[PDB]
Amino acid sequence: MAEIPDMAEIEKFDKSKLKKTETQEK
Amino acid sequence: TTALVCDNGSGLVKAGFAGDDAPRAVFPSIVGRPSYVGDEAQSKRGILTLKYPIEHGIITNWDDMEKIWHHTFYNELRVAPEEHPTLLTEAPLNPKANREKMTQIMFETFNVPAMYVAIQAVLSLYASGRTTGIVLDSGDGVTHNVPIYEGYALPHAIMRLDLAGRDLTDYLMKILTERGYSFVTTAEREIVRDIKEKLCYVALDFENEMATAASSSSLEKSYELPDGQVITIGNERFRCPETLFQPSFIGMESAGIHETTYNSIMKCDIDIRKDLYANNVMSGGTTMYPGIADRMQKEITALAPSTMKIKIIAPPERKYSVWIGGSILASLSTFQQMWITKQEYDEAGPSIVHRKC
Amino acid sequence: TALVCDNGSGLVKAGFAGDDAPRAVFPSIVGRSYVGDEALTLKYPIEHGIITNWDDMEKIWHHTFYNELRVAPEEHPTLLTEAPLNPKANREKMTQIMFETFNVPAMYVAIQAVLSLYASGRTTGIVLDSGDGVTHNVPIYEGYALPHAIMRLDLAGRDLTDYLMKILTERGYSFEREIVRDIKEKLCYVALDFENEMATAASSSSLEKSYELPDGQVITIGNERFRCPETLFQPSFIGMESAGIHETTYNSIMKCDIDIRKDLYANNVMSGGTTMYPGIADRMQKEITALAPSTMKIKIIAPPERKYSVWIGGSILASLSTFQQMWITKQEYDEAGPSIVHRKC
Ligand SMILES: Nc1ncnc2c1ncn2[C@@H]1O[C@H](COP(=O)(O)OP(=O)(O)OP(=O)(O)O)[C@@H](O)[C@H]1O
Ligand SMILES: Nc1ncnc2c1ncn2[C@@H]1O[C@H](COP(=O)(O)OP(=O)(O)OP(=O)(O)O)[C@@H](O)[C@H]1O
Ligand SMILES: [Ca+2]
Ligand SMILES: [Ca+2]
Numbered sequence: 001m002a003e004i005p006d007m008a009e010i011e012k013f014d015k016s017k018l019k020k021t022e023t024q025e026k
Numbered sequence: 027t028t029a030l031v032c033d034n035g036s037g038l039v040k041a042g043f044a045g046d047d048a049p050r051a052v053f054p055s056i057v058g059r060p061s062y063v064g065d066e067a068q069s070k071r072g073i074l075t076l077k078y079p080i081e082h083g084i085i086t087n088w089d090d091m092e093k094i095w096h097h098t099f100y101n102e103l104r105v106a107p108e109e110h111p112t113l114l115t116e117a118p119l120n121p122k123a124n125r126e127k128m129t130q131i132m133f134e135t136f137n138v139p140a141m142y143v144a145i146q147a148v149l150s151l152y153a154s155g156r157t158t159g160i161v162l163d164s165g166d167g168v169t170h171n172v173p174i175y176e177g178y179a180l181p182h183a184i185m186r187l188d189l190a191g192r193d194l195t196d197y198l199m200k201i202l203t204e205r206g207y208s209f210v211t212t213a214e215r216e217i218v219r220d221i222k223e224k225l226c227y228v229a230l231d232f233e234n235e236m237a238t239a240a241s242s243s244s245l246e247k248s249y250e251l252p253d254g255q256v257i258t259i260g261n262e263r264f265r266c267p268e269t270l271f272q273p274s275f276i277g278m279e280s281a282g283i284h285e286t287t288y289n290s291i292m293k294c295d296i297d298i299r300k301d302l303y304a305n306n307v308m309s310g311g312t313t314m315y316p317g318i319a320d321r322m323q324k325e326i327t328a329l330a331p332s333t334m335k336i337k338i339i340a341p342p343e344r345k346y347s348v349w350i351g352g353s354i355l356a357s358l359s360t361f362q363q364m365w366i367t368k369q370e371y372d373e374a375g376p377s378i379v380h381r382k383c
Numbered sequence: 384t385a386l387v388c389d390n391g392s393g394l395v396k397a398g399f400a401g402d403d404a405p406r407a408v409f410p411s412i413v414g415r416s417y418v419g420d421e422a423l424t425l426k427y428p429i430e431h432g433i434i435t436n437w438d439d440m441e442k443i444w445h446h447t448f449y450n451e452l453r454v455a456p457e458e459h460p461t462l463l464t465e466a467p468l469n470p471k472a473n474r475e476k477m478t479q480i481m482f483e484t485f486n487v488p489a490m491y492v493a494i495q496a497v498l499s500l501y502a503s504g505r506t507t508g509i510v511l512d513s514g515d516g517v518t519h520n521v522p523i524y525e526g527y528a529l530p531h532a533i534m535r536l537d538l539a540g541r542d543l544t545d546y547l548m549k550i551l552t553e554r555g556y557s558f559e560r561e562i563v564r565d566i567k568e569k570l571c572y573v574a575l576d577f578e579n580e581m582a583t584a585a586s587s588s589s590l591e592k593s594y595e596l597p598d599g600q601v602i603t604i605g606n607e608r609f610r611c612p613e614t615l616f617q618p619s620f621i622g623m624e625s626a627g628i629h630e631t632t633y634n635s636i637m638k639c640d641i642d643i644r645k646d647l648y649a650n651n652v653m654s655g656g657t658t659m660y661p662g663i664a665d666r667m668q669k670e671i672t673a674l675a676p677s678t679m680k681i682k683i684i685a686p687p688e689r690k691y692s693v694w695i696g697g698s699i700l701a702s703l704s705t706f707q708q709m710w711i712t713k714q715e716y717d718e719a720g721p722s723i724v725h726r727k728c
Contacts, residue, residue, distance in 0.1 A: 182722055
């Protein structure tokens with residue numbers, strides 16, 4: 001507007017870096 | 027400050043924080059009135075009338091849906107909505123008015139600073155590390171085949187089947203009752219769901235499996251009821267999820283999930299079919315049956331050209347794949363421009379959701 | 384080099400991205416085949432801004448690429464334009480034809496009013512776009528046309544030409560349409576105060592104009608000069624029950640959220656051939672101001688070249704570095720098919 005990659009980040013994402021967390025479910 | 031991820035399904039809400047590897051809270055998508063939400067409604071279902079605000083993946087009761095979202099933010103996650111960008115999920119082919127209504131409620135009722143709506147199957151694909159492939163998403167209320175090219179769900183090829191986990195539970199109830207057992211009270215329905223999730227499986231060849239169950243006890247499993255009675259489950263183990271492949275079992279005239287998968291691929295351009303066949307990702311609670319990946323491999327192989335490389339991907343965490351994909355997406359640096367902000371909403375209104383989602 | 388093709392109900396405007404004007408302008412007509420000037424059954428493949436005859440549209444695009452621009456389509460990324468609220472299926476068909484019939488390496492479809500806004504150097508404002516077949520009011524927020532506030536009025540240049548024919552006939556003339564269209568474009572203007580202009584027209588020494596017909600007859604036009612485009616402000620002149628373009632502008636603004644209205648009022652952009660009448664900007668300034676709150680700052684932007692603003696906006700957009708990612712490539716089309724247009728457009 002002043003003048004007037006997205007997919008690669010998904011494909012290379014490292015899921016091991018997601019935080020462990022406790023899931024509450026009955 | 028952390029972004030929230032809320033994955034609203036027909037049977038279960040999955041909710042948590044972006045960047046986590048799993049939802050903090052999972053609870054039934056139910057509202058009860060003589061209001062109560064989720065777990066506290068199913069534990070009081072005697073004094074209460076129960077309602078499901080999402081049917082077949084689609085929000086149909088907006089009053090009750092706000093109660094669910096209220097319960098999610100305050101009771102379950104214990105956050106003030108105005109402090110957290112919130113990512114929501116939606117079904118493939120969700121009507122435009124629904125996406126606008128969802129946006130209006132988030133900004134005007136809960137005052138979130140930013141929001142985004144993502145297609146559930148696309149999130150599942152993302153969770154498997156892919157941006158192209160075809161997702162089989164099967165939950166409690168609906169099953170979809172969703173072919174996706176670089177994050178874009180191909181709308182002319184999306185297939186919908188209104189048969190999923192709730193139907194399978196109902197069917198198992200029916201055939202177990204036929205075998206002489208009794209499962210009628212709501213507490214007894216929970217038993218049948220437990221049996222379904224623990225003892226059922228998808229046969230590789232149904233008719234041969236029926237023949238094998240008939241000539242020997244080799245396919246039989248025992249299940250201990252709450253009172254201590256031990257019961258035997260035989261061909262019901264695989265007859266129940268066979269319904270996915272043969273919807274005629276419950277009187278539905280649709281093709282089964284192998285054929286809708288094939289039909290979906292054939293509604294895509296020839297150039298992408300090779301990539302779809304090699305990237306069949308299974309998502310949702312009802313894809314958890316032992317044997318289902320291998321059965322799908324067999325059936326798709328029978329339908330596809332003989333030279334086609336076919337691969338079924340069935341992640342162990344696929345009960346929560348949608349949520350995990352949302353958690354990933356909302357964590358990406360390239361995604362932060364994608365949020366719809368309250369400032370934008372103030373200017374453009376609910377239709378701003380079509381600019382980014 | 385990118386091509387820019389702006390297809391209208393009456394005229395095709397086509398050229399090269401980076402140029403300040405379209406190289407080719409010709410009638411959007413097919414006769415049965417004959418295209419444009421050389422055109423039998425006559426047909427307009429675009430009606431009120433919408434493509435309705437696809438075989439004829441392909442004849443138009445063929446004529447545009449080869450006969451007018453003298454290019455090979457497969458060598459050029461091509462930017463096309465579409466009307467506000469163009470049905471999804473139509474945008475897919477345009478995409479399918481460009482890739483499968485003309486084999487372009489890349490394409491994009493942009494909303495006409497949005498391009499006009501860009502041509503005036505803005506990304507937020509409200510556009511009045513009035514051509515040969517349709518008039519739109521399009522409020523826009525950061526390049527996004529606000530779908531619930533868009534107004535469409537099927538009153539434009541062709542109707543004004545027809546009306547000029549009718550009122551000239553009232554005084555004894557006989558009609559020949561192409562001649563009247565020429566008279567319209569050369570001699571007509573918008574009166575600042577219509578009733579006052581009517582009452583005083585007999586004593587004006589300036590208002591009568593002579594027009595030399597092709598065979599050589601000299602005929603005179605008086606108050607028809609400003610009565611013809613008055614129709615834009617008073618659609619009842621042609622038996623139409625719509626409010627005039629000042630009111631549809633106001634109504635469109637009033638369908639937008641209050642937070643954006645100041646910016647809409649201060650960024651009223653006029654676009655299209657039927658906004659070319661002398662006096663129309665000042666008449667609009669008067670009429671919109673009368674409707675708006677007194678505290679509101681009102682600005683009408685009416686560039687001299689606004690006959691080609693849509694095309695110019697396209698030329699600009701297609702030249703931007705931030706836009707190059709937005710092109711739909713042949714490879715993407717090959718994988719996803721025509722629905723890929725909804726991912727990028
Ligand atoms: N191990 C399992 N085996 C078989 N079925 C299971 C298993 N675990 C969960 N399910 C079924 O999965 C369903 C819930 O899955 P999920 O959370 O994906 O659905 P949802 O998102 O609530 O519904 P939908 O996607 O249909 O709107 C329930 O019917 C449940 O019984
Ligand atoms: N100087 C002028 N004064 C008045 N009208 C003019 C002038 N020049 C051109 N026009 C009219 O503008 C119209 C064509 O403009 P334009 O190219 O913007 O329309 P279009 O794109 O073909 O149609 P639409 O936008 O309605 O689909 C014709 O009716 C023509 O007579
Ligand atoms: Ca779901
Ligand atoms: Ca036009």
